Short mmCIF file of C-alpha atoms and ligand atoms in Angstrom, two decimals:
data_model
loop_
_atom_site.label_atom_id
_atom_site.label_comp_id
_atom_site.label_asym_id
_atom_site.label_seq_id
_atom_site.Cartn_x
_atom_site.Cartn_y
_atom_site.Cartn_z
CA UNK U 214 -0.02 -0.03 -0.01
CA UNK U 215 1.89 3.04 -1.31
CA UNK U 216 1.27 6.03 0.90
CA UNK U 217 2.60 9.54 1.62
CA UNK U 218 2.60 11.84 4.62
CA UNK U 219 2.00 15.57 5.11
CA UNK U 220 3.08 17.50 8.23
CA UNK U 221 3.68 21.06 9.29
CA UNK U 222 3.71 23.44 12.24
CA UNK U 223 5.94 21.40 14.50
CA UNK U 224 7.91 24.41 15.77
CA UNK U 225 10.71 22.23 17.09
CA UNK U 226 12.62 23.78 19.91
CA UNK U 227 14.81 22.72 22.85
CA UNK U 228 12.22 24.45 25.10
CA UNK U 229 9.77 21.71 23.90
CA UNK U 230 11.51 18.31 23.77
CA UNK U 231 8.16 16.55 23.93
CA UNK U 232 7.53 17.17 20.22
CA UNK U 233 11.05 16.31 19.14
CA UNK U 234 10.38 12.87 20.63
CA UNK U 235 7.17 12.66 18.61
CA UNK U 236 9.09 13.76 15.52
CA UNK U 237 11.79 11.10 16.12
CA UNK U 238 9.17 8.37 16.41
CA UNK U 239 7.44 9.49 13.23
CA UNK U 240 10.61 9.83 11.14
CA UNK U 241 12.05 6.51 12.30
CA UNK U 242 8.90 4.35 12.30
CA UNK U 243 6.44 5.68 9.71
CA UNK U 244 8.30 7.98 7.36
CA UNK U 245 10.69 5.28 5.94
CA UNK U 246 7.72 3.35 4.57
CA UNK U 247 6.25 6.43 2.82
CA UNK U 248 6.50 7.18 -0.89
CA UNK U 249 6.73 10.97 -0.31
CA UNK U 250 7.14 13.26 2.69
CA UNK U 251 5.95 16.88 2.46
CA UNK U 252 6.82 19.29 5.25
CA UNK U 253 4.69 22.40 4.68
CA UNK U 254 6.58 24.97 6.80
CA UNK U 255 7.15 25.77 10.45
CA UNK U 256 9.33 22.78 11.00
CA UNK U 257 11.45 24.83 13.44
CA UNK U 258 10.35 27.38 16.03
CA UNK U 259 12.44 29.85 14.08
CA UNK U 260 15.23 29.82 11.50
CA UNK U 261 17.84 32.54 11.19
CA UNK U 262 20.08 31.04 8.52
CA UNK U 263 21.45 27.76 7.15
CA UNK U 264 24.63 28.06 9.35
CA UNK U 265 22.62 27.41 12.52
CA UNK U 266 24.12 24.56 14.54
CA UNK U 267 22.83 22.68 17.63
CA UNK U 268 22.18 19.20 18.89
CA UNK U 269 18.49 19.59 17.94
CA UNK U 270 19.21 20.97 14.49
CA UNK U 271 21.69 18.30 13.66
CA UNK U 272 19.21 15.69 14.91
CA UNK U 273 16.33 17.00 12.78
CA UNK U 274 18.58 17.21 9.72
CA UNK U 275 19.72 13.65 10.30
CA UNK U 276 16.20 12.30 10.53
CA UNK U 277 15.30 13.94 7.21
CA UNK U 278 18.51 12.66 5.59
CA UNK U 279 17.95 9.10 6.83
CA UNK U 280 14.42 9.06 5.45
CA UNK U 281 15.52 10.68 2.18
CA UNK U 282 18.48 8.30 1.51
CA UNK U 283 16.09 5.38 1.86
CA UNK U 284 14.32 6.57 -1.29
CA UNK U 285 11.52 8.62 0.28
CA UNK U 286 10.98 11.79 -1.76
CA UNK U 287 11.21 14.59 0.76
CA UNK U 288 9.95 18.16 0.14
CA UNK U 289 10.01 21.32 2.24
CA UNK U 290 7.79 24.35 1.74
CA UNK U 291 8.71 27.50 3.68
CA UNK U 292 6.63 28.66 6.63
CA UNK U 293 6.59 32.00 8.34
CA UNK U 294 8.90 30.74 11.12
CA UNK U 295 11.55 29.27 8.78
CA UNK U 296 11.39 31.09 5.47
CA UNK U 297 15.20 31.59 5.53
CA UNK U 298 15.88 27.86 4.72
CA UNK U 299 18.00 27.79 1.60
CA UNK U 300 20.01 25.64 -0.83
CA UNK U 301 22.48 24.47 1.85
CA UNK U 302 19.83 23.08 4.11
CA UNK U 303 18.32 21.36 1.07
CA UNK U 304 21.61 19.64 0.13
CA UNK U 305 22.35 18.53 3.70
CA UNK U 306 18.90 16.95 4.17
CA UNK U 307 17.72 15.79 0.73
CA UNK U 308 14.55 17.82 1.17
CA UNK U 309 13.76 19.62 -2.09
CA UNK U 310 12.57 23.26 -1.69
CA UNK U 311 9.06 24.00 -2.97
CA UNK U 312 7.75 27.50 -3.90
CA UNK U 313 5.00 29.14 -1.81
CA UNK U 314 2.38 27.38 -3.96
CA UNK U 315 2.90 23.97 -5.47
CA UNK U 316 0.54 21.91 -7.56
CA UNK U 317 1.25 18.16 -7.24
CA UNK U 318 -0.18 15.02 -8.80
CA UNK U 319 -0.41 12.20 -6.26
CA UNK U 320 -2.54 9.06 -6.40
CA UNK U 321 -4.56 10.36 -9.34
CA UNK U 322 -5.38 13.56 -7.46
CA UNK U 323 -4.49 17.16 -8.29
CA UNK U 324 -3.52 18.87 -5.02
CA UNK U 325 -2.51 22.42 -4.20
CA UNK U 326 0.09 22.85 -1.43
CA UNK U 327 0.84 26.03 0.49
CA UNK U 328 1.82 26.92 4.02
CA UNK U 329 -1.43 28.86 4.63
CA UNK U 330 -0.16 32.27 5.64
CA UNK U 331 -0.57 33.73 2.12
CA UNK U 332 -4.31 32.96 2.44
CA UNK U 333 -4.80 35.11 5.54
CA UNK U 334 -4.99 38.27 3.47
CA UNK U 335 -7.14 40.17 5.97
CA UNK U 336 -4.27 40.13 8.46
CA UNK U 337 -2.82 43.19 6.69
CA UNK U 338 -0.27 43.78 9.47
CA UNK U 339 1.14 40.31 8.87
CA UNK U 340 1.00 40.61 5.07
CA UNK U 341 2.94 43.89 5.12
CA UNK U 342 5.57 42.30 7.40
CA UNK U 343 5.68 39.28 5.04
CA UNK U 344 6.45 41.49 2.01
CA UNK U 345 9.39 43.10 3.81
CA UNK U 346 11.20 39.99 5.09
CA UNK U 347 10.77 38.20 1.72
CA UNK U 348 12.85 40.79 -0.10
CA UNK U 349 16.18 39.17 -1.13
CA UNK U 350 18.40 42.21 -0.51
CA UNK U 351 17.32 42.54 3.13
CA UNK U 352 17.79 38.79 3.66
CA UNK U 353 21.37 39.12 2.43
CA UNK U 354 21.83 41.89 4.96
CA UNK U 355 20.33 39.88 7.81
CA UNK U 356 22.54 36.86 7.14
CA UNK U 357 25.67 39.05 7.22
CA UNK U 358 25.10 39.66 10.93
CA UNK U 359 26.72 37.25 13.39
CA UNK U 360 24.82 34.11 14.39
CA UNK U 361 24.31 35.29 17.97
CA UNK U 362 22.75 38.63 17.11
CA UNK U 363 20.23 37.10 14.64
CA UNK U 364 18.97 34.75 17.42
CA UNK U 365 18.10 37.66 19.69
CA UNK U 366 16.46 39.48 16.78
CA UNK U 367 14.50 36.32 16.06
CA UNK U 368 13.55 35.81 19.77
CA UNK U 369 12.39 39.41 19.98
CA UNK U 370 10.54 39.35 16.63
CA UNK U 371 8.91 36.21 17.99
CA UNK U 372 8.17 38.26 21.20
CA UNK U 373 6.53 41.12 19.36
CA UNK U 374 4.48 38.74 17.18
CA UNK U 375 3.16 37.14 20.41
CA UNK U 376 1.98 40.53 21.56
CA UNK U 377 0.39 41.59 18.20
CA UNK U 378 -1.62 38.30 18.00
CA UNK U 379 -3.39 39.01 21.29
CA UNK U 380 -4.36 42.42 19.72
CA UNK U 381 -5.99 40.58 16.81
CA UNK U 382 -9.29 38.74 16.48
CA UNK U 383 -9.41 35.13 15.35
CA UNK U 384 -11.24 36.03 12.09
CA UNK U 385 -8.45 38.00 10.50
CA UNK U 386 -5.81 35.44 11.59
CA UNK U 387 -7.57 32.70 9.66
CA UNK U 388 -7.85 32.06 5.93
CA UNK U 389 -9.98 34.33 3.73
CA UNK U 390 -12.48 32.02 2.14
CA UNK U 391 -13.05 33.92 -1.14
CA UNK U 392 -9.26 34.29 -1.74
CA UNK U 393 -8.79 30.59 -0.89
CA UNK U 394 -11.56 29.67 -3.31
CA UNK U 395 -9.92 31.75 -6.04
CA UNK U 396 -6.54 29.98 -5.42
CA UNK U 397 -8.19 26.59 -5.88
CA UNK U 398 -9.76 27.73 -9.13
CA UNK U 399 -6.45 29.10 -10.46
CA UNK U 400 -4.75 25.77 -10.09
CA UNK U 401 -7.80 23.73 -11.13
CA UNK U 402 -7.85 21.50 -8.04
CA UNK U 403 -10.42 19.78 -5.82
CA UNK U 404 -7.93 19.30 -2.96
CA UNK U 405 -5.93 21.86 -0.98
CA UNK U 406 -3.56 21.11 1.92
CA UNK U 407 -2.10 23.81 4.14
CA UNK U 408 -1.02 24.48 7.70
CA UNK U 409 -0.19 27.63 9.71
CA UNK U 410 -3.70 28.23 11.12
CA UNK U 411 -3.01 25.70 13.93
CA UNK U 412 -6.57 24.25 13.77
CA UNK U 413 -6.48 20.71 12.37
CA UNK U 414 -9.55 20.15 10.17
CA UNK U 415 -11.03 18.69 7.01
CA UNK U 416 -13.55 20.91 5.31
CA UNK U 417 -15.65 19.36 2.55
CA UNK U 418 -16.79 22.43 0.63
CA UNK U 419 -18.92 21.99 -2.49
CA UNK U 420 -16.20 22.81 -5.03
CA UNK U 421 -13.22 21.35 -3.08
CA UNK U 422 -11.88 19.93 0.12
CA UNK U 423 -9.46 21.90 2.27
CA UNK U 424 -7.23 19.85 4.58
CA UNK U 425 -5.67 21.85 7.46
CA UNK U 426 -2.68 20.40 9.22
CA UNK U 427 -2.64 21.22 12.93
CA UNK U 428 0.11 22.18 15.34
CA UNK U 429 2.04 19.46 17.18
CA UNK U 430 1.49 19.57 20.93
CA UNK U 431 3.14 17.41 23.55
CA UNK U 432 0.26 14.86 23.54
CA UNK U 433 -0.61 14.98 19.80
CA UNK U 434 1.24 14.77 16.47
CA UNK U 435 -0.80 16.02 13.50
CA UNK U 436 0.07 13.77 10.56
CA UNK U 437 -1.95 13.46 7.33
CA UNK U 438 -1.67 10.22 5.34
CA UNK U 439 -2.79 9.61 1.78
CA UNK U 440 -2.51 6.21 -0.01
CA UNK U 441 -3.06 4.85 -3.52
CA UNK U 442 -6.64 3.87 -2.59
CA UNK U 443 -7.54 7.57 -2.67
CA UNK U 444 -8.27 7.79 1.04
CA UNK U 445 -6.71 10.24 3.42
CA UNK U 446 -6.92 11.13 7.09
CA UNK U 447 -4.90 12.04 10.15
CA UNK U 448 -2.87 9.36 11.91
CA UNK U 449 -4.71 9.10 15.23
CA UNK U 450 -2.22 8.15 17.98
C1 LP5 G 166 15.03 39.42 6.39
C2 LP5 G 166 14.57 39.49 7.80
C3 LP5 G 166 14.85 38.13 8.50
C4 LP5 G 166 14.06 38.07 9.80
C5 LP5 G 166 14.15 36.62 10.28
C6 LP5 G 166 12.91 36.32 11.19
C7 LP5 G 166 13.27 35.13 12.11
C8 LP5 G 166 12.05 34.89 13.00
C9 LP5 G 166 10.78 34.77 12.10
C10 LP5 G 166 9.66 34.12 12.92
C11 LP5 G 166 8.72 35.21 13.48
C12 LP5 G 166 7.28 34.88 13.05
O1 LP5 G 166 6.63 34.18 14.05
C13 LP5 G 166 6.56 36.22 12.83
C14 LP5 G 166 5.18 35.98 12.11
O2 LP5 G 166 5.16 35.92 10.95
N1 LP5 G 166 4.00 35.95 12.92
C15 LP5 G 166 2.67 35.76 12.23
C16 LP5 G 166 2.16 34.36 12.56
O3 LP5 G 166 2.17 34.18 13.87
P1 LP5 G 166 2.74 32.69 14.42
O4 LP5 G 166 2.58 32.53 15.91
O5 LP5 G 166 4.20 32.67 14.07
O6 LP5 G 166 1.95 31.61 13.73
O7 LP5 G 166 0.77 34.18 12.06
C17 LP5 G 166 -0.16 35.17 12.61
C18 LP5 G 166 -1.48 34.91 12.08
O8 LP5 G 166 -1.42 34.90 10.65
C19 LP5 G 166 0.35 36.59 12.19
O9 LP5 G 166 -0.45 37.60 12.75
C20 LP5 G 166 1.68 36.80 12.71
O10 LP5 G 166 2.16 38.13 12.25
C21 LP5 G 166 2.62 39.03 13.24
O11 LP5 G 166 2.17 38.94 14.35
C22 LP5 G 166 3.70 40.02 12.89
C23 LP5 G 166 3.38 41.30 13.64
O12 LP5 G 166 2.06 41.67 13.41
C24 LP5 G 166 4.32 42.41 13.15
C25 LP5 G 166 5.77 41.95 13.16
C26 LP5 G 166 6.68 43.14 13.31
C27 LP5 G 166 8.02 42.75 14.00
C28 LP5 G 166 9.15 43.63 13.55
C29 LP5 G 166 8.94 44.18 12.15
C30 LP5 G 166 10.23 44.75 11.57
C31 LP5 G 166 10.46 44.25 10.20
C32 LP5 G 166 11.82 43.59 10.12
C33 LP5 G 166 12.53 43.87 8.81
C34 LP5 G 166 14.05 43.56 8.98
MN1 MN G 167 2.73 29.29 10.14
MN1 MN G 168 3.02 27.93 12.87
#
């Protein structure tokens, strides 16, 4: 039974070693038997450049490389927490980098993949911040700074973002339905998979189905599985 997995929004961090354990069990016991593994952003709590080094980072890279070298096709799509991942991280892990939208053909299904933050177009404060940090010239500037200063910048940008979110309603921090519907029509799909919005769900709209990967918490790993029988669903337990 050929099958593939979809995960996102793990936000791996030394502060939370409960998820890393869940990630190790998934990568060592289920991922090797998969045909493809897609990681749709927010694998790390934050990413400040491909020269980051730590016991947790070298662990996570190893798990991806071990799954990849066994013939599993691994893909990474950027999230908002780790959009700085580049060509070096891709070579070290085997995970091929996908653009912010990617149409795939899997098990006779046309599927649109994105992280999910580009669909929250009513969060205008976030979208303006997203346009700035995605400019290549400023990213080259940021990566020229020493490793230690970028971490504090990241920890404080994280800190501000935690404040601004409590200033926002839940509506504008979720996906705009009309825009999301237009995306699906642009790519000609009946199936859309994304993360970012934290709320694991499967919405069976009339025109299409929208699968939402949830956050990983200490007691739950959100893992979507599709197989060649055309079924899909989240690995419970
Ligand atoms: C080239 C520069 C490199 C910088 C490297 C950055 C390294 C760290 C990046 C991770 C931070 C990331 O969490 C910020 C973010 O995206 N938050 C949005 C998101 O909230 P989450 O909890 O992360 O899901 O989802 C929420 C719902 O959609 C959304 O609301 C949040 O958006 C925010 O809260 C952002 C704040 O509203 C504004 C942020 C301003 C902070 C400083 C801006 C200065 C611009 C810096 C330019 C150099
Ligand atoms: Mn996100
Ligand atoms: Mn996230």
